[PDB]
Every structure is written in structure tokens, then in C-alpha cells.
Symmetry: D2
Subunit: 116 residues, 4 copies
């Protein structure tokens, strides 16, 4: 699994479940092409977005729909979404774990990059 | 000053100086329109991006060039940039302070909204 | 002002007002000695904790009463408090700003050390 | 496993490996009694600190030796340690995952609390 995303809720102290996210890859013309999408599980994780063969070198963007998540909980949050834009596999193939911690007016994102 | 951005460096424990950022506003046609830009001062702050008259309700994006910042320091970063996308809403008088804390492989952002 | 503490609320997007905190200094016998204390202002800041003459090198602890803050807001928190333990070191003139960002189940702290 | 700790390094984008930590429990006289300790694995995790029978209600403190971690990497960090002080199992038994993200001048801690 080359790309995994984990989302946590800092208000409830729990995984952020059923959070939608969309992954895009930058094309040669500088436009964002849809690449993959899914929703976090009961553990706040989203696995299986891509495969080693499909996840080629490039610039990727993960847009996490945090606004719909907070709205479902009765909160009007500050951000429209939480994101990560990064270059993947430019110095060889890697496994990427993107972790996001959510609050109504704040978010943090971190990456764990390991050699397969 | 209705919009202020402050950027901190979690590696050096200091303000993040000379960090470039661009602000965009989403137009009725769903496109991002350039709105303002600048670079952080010696205090890690960027003031004067907009005025009360110009800063109307809408969806705004602040793209912070974190990658060039880390490259200038000789540190290999993860993110291409740090985005902050938010709706500006009139609900009494409001001023927005966007604070970003930067690390090579992580960033955090918060908003302080005051009256 | 050699030591300043700023506290922000990530749920309300505002300064964290009337937050109590106690500062301790580790003495030669390994015990924690009370050093200073106060409550954050309407701007979420606590200034005037110490002076340049009093703030010598040593190991200091700032215990922020986050639990009472969340309880006052009717939100069930995780942490009893947020500690910040650090060494103050003379390496040219220095001023310390401790910034804490609070959520019910999480907190972040950073230091901005300037000359 | 009622208590698990995960530590990440925000400078290298990796798990924080071989990080020492000590867990204390507050006694009736308000003093901190040593409870458990260990070091994070190659995955930045520390499992098996306690058992369901031993992990009774109380106030606990996890002190993570972040200073020795940064010093081993050639960095003189700001904090002496990263910590979490919390009341455990006061409203029934729970499983606690403490996550810490480390930078030389900053740290973040979050808890994921789930019902067994």
C-alpha cells in the first residue's frame, strides 16, 4: 500500500469516521487530474487509494472534506478542507502515510515516508 | 487590518522570515482569482494584504510557499506549500489572523477570529 | 519582557481567556520551586511573569490549567493540564514566547526564541 | 492493550525510534509513583506498557524523553520532554492511544479514546 491516510478528531478524541477525500495528480498542462477518492473507515483510515504501479512520480494533492465532517457534527468550521500537496517518488519509490488532526478552527498534517 | 498571516518555524524556534504567500478569492464561475500577496517580515508576519472595503464575504485561499522556505535553509521538505482555504463570513465585526507553524514534514494552521 | 505565554482555543477560533498557569524553576536539590503565575488576558496573553534580572538560566516548567478552561466551556477534556518544560540558556540576548494551541483531546506548544 | 503510545518525527518524516518514556500514577499523597516504562519500536510505537487489570482508575503521566532523542540526532531542542497528564478510566474502562508529533522547538500530543 503506497498511500494511506489517517484522520483524527481533536474535539471527540476519536478517529474521524466517514470523512470523504479526493486525490489529484498534476498533469503536464499544470491542471489537477482526478486520481482516486474514498472515505475513512471506523478506524479513521483510508487504505487502497492506489497501487505501486499506478502511483508514479508526480505532484499529488489530497483534499480532505473537513467542512462536511464538522457540519455533520453540528459545527460550522473555519476551513473548507484540509490538504496535503506533495511530490511523490521523485528520489525512488516510497510508502506515504498522511496523518491529519482536525479541530473546528485548526488542523495539522504530517507525513511518515518510509522506504519499501 | 482585516486579514493578517503569521508564520513560525518549529525547527529554529523563530518567526519564519521572507516566506512568500499568495491569496486568492473564489469567483462566481468557480475559478480562483488572484487577490493579494506578499512576504513575511522579520517578525514572521504579513500585514496589509487587504482592506475592510475589499475584504468581502467569500471563499479565500492562502497558499504559503513552504517548500522554497525549507530549501533556502537546506532542509528537504515534504509539502509543496501550505494551503489555508476558508469562508469569510459577516457575523458582527471580524478580523482574521491565520497562524501557521512549519516543520519539514508537518504543518499546523489555526485561525483566530476576533471582534 | 523575557517570558510571555500566549494561549489559543482551536474549537472557538479565539484567544483562550482567563486560563490559569503556574511557572516553576528547578532548584539545585531537584525540587520544583514556585516562580510566577497568572491568568491569560482577553487577548489570550500572559505578560509580566518575570523580569530580566530574575529570569536566570535554569530548567523551568509552565503548567497551564487546560482542564478548568474546557470545564468552564462545558466540554469534556482529556488532559489535566498542558506542561511546557524547557531549559533557559544565555546565548546572546533572548526573549521567550511560549505559544499553546488547545483542543479538548489535543494540544500543541511551540517556542519562539528571539534576540 | 489499554495504553499505547506512538511518536513521530516532524523533521525526518518518520517514526521516532528508540524514544524512552516513563509512565507515573498519582498516589493518595499527591506524589508521582513509577508505573511503567519502555522505548518506541522501529514503527515509533510502544505497546505492552500495562494490562487491563493493572490499569485502574487514576491520574497518569507519560513523560517522553524528547531531549535525549534530539540530542542523539545532533539537535539541541527547546523542551526537556513531551508529556501527557490525564485521568484514566473514571467513566468506565477505555483503550487509550497517545500520539506525539515532535519538532526541535514544538510538539503536539493527541489522544484517541475508544470503548473496549
Amino acid at each position: 500500500c503506497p498511500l494511506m491516510v489517517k484522520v483524527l478528531d481533536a474535539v471527540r478524541g476519536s478517529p474521524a469516521i466517514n470523512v470523504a477525500m479526493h486525490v489529484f495528480r498534476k498533469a503536464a498542462d499544470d491542471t489537477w487530474e482526478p486520481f482516486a477518492s474514498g472515505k475513512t473507515s471506523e478506524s479513521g483510515e483510508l487504505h487502497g487509494l492506489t497501487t505501486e504501479e499506478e502511483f508514479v512520480e508526480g505532484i499529488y494533492k489530497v483534499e480532505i472534506d473537513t467542512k462536511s465532517y464538522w457540519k455533520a457534527l453540528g459545527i460550522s468550521p473555519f476551513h473548507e478542507h484540509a490538504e496535503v500537496v506533495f511530490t511523490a517518488n521523485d528520489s525512488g519509490p516510497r510508502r506515504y502515510t498522511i496523518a491529519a488532526l482536525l479541530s473546528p478552527y485548526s488542523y495539522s498534517t504530517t507525513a511518515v515516508v518510509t522506504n519499501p
